[PDB]
Design a protein around this ligand. Sequence first.
Ligand SMILES: Nc1ncnc2c1ncn2[C@@H]1O[C@H](COP(=O)(O)OP(=O)(O)OP(=O)(O)O)[C@@H](O)[C@H]1O
Ligand code: NA
Length: 416
Amino acid sequence: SLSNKLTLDKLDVKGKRVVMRVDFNVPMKNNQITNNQRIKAAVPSIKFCLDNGAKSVVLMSHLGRPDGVPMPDKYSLEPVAVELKSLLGKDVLFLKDCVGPEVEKACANPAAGSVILLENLRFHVEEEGKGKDASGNKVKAEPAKIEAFRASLSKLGDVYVNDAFGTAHRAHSSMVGVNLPQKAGGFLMKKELNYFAKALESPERPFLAILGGAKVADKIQLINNMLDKVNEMIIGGGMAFTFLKVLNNMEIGTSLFDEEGAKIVKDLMSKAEKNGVKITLPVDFVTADKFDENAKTGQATVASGIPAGWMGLDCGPESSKKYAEAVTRAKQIVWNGPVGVFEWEAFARGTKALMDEVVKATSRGCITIIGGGDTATCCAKWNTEDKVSHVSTGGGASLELLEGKVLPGVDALSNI
Ligand SMILES: Nc1ncnc2c1ncn2[C@@H]1O[C@H](COP(=O)(O)OP(=O)(O)OP(=O)(O)O)[C@@H](O)[C@H]1O
Ligand code: NA
């Protein structure tokens, strides 16, 4: 997987400036970092570079989805710089941009051992290649400016390391576009890829995938290929309402809905039937009159529908029972995406109950893999990081491995 690729343990960094993509896309609440998992996970690679004599380590990441507009009031990485201090035992220089002559000067010839964190890559449309303007109109990036963006990032180091497993499914500029002669996979990239390579070679069966969360447009497009690998799927969280509206003609109110994915729902169900994959969808819900921690709440079922102006933000008790039945049958589980808005206590019961079931499954020998920026925060919140088989820093990235793909961030590394 990385067998063919240059990795950091084989990269001479002595006297070299290292430019490192990392996944510091950490969850935030009340403007605080709620889980430093993804930051801590990159420390081994950073520390290795500094201990083996790197002149500098320049760290670069996105945070959230600002869609190519500078929104430091809301998606700045400065809080991550602070947290990384503590985890490293080294101070960190935070720059307010990631490209341009001022950044290039700050990284051109740093004091020996400097750790530099750049501002959010996605404040530039050239990272993703597309985004929105500040008025919210979709925009494409211009090829020549994408090249200039990649050229600028490439000047910030002499060698490149990608340790950003959580983002490895994204063919973004900082992930596939850095032009330096040595492009090496970091130790987190190696740890995660090696874990999944073995867990996915010959899964214990039944193999259950649990797909929830809120990235519906993206992740509904992964189900088709996953249906060739798994024996059961829970489709919950925000993902479920697109399925229920199409299959059950359910009223879903203002719940998350994907117009494009709705067009393939019946094809996915046909393929699940063809491949013998049991699909478990929720049958009841905790509702809210608005997207707010303190919203008024209600209950609902698929038969009742969700009232107009209301949204389903958690599953209900009968859904938790059905989810639990699927977990009990499983011998291997991969779970990405909470089955409700677990950050808010009114909407956390379904995710907590499913966590309880997954922990119990682990205790009787199920191989249990939970991954994602927010889903791993469930493990931190309820203190189950040591009670499942593997907590991954990749969510969507892990689902694309489950599909059987080579991740773009891996593919772009140097061959041995
Ligand atoms: N019914 C729902 N409506 C809206 N949001 C939901 C619902 N159920 C869960 N969520 C939200 O889904 C979010 C997580 O979805 P997401 O797909 O980002 O998962 P993730 O584990 O961070 O995955 P990745 O690592 O790929 O980003 C949480 O913030 C949670 O509030
Ligand atoms: Na997320």
